[PDB]
């Protein structure tokens, strides 16, 4: 996936969508 590591460390969408939908 296009998305770094701490946005799944910090599960919560704080990143966008696309990294967990």
């Known amino acids: 996936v296009q998305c ?3 946005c799944y460390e910090l ?3 704080l990143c966008p969508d ?3 939908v």
């Open 4 to 6: 770094p590591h701490f």
């Open 11 to 13: 599960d919560y969408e």
């Open 18 to 20: 696309v990294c967990y």
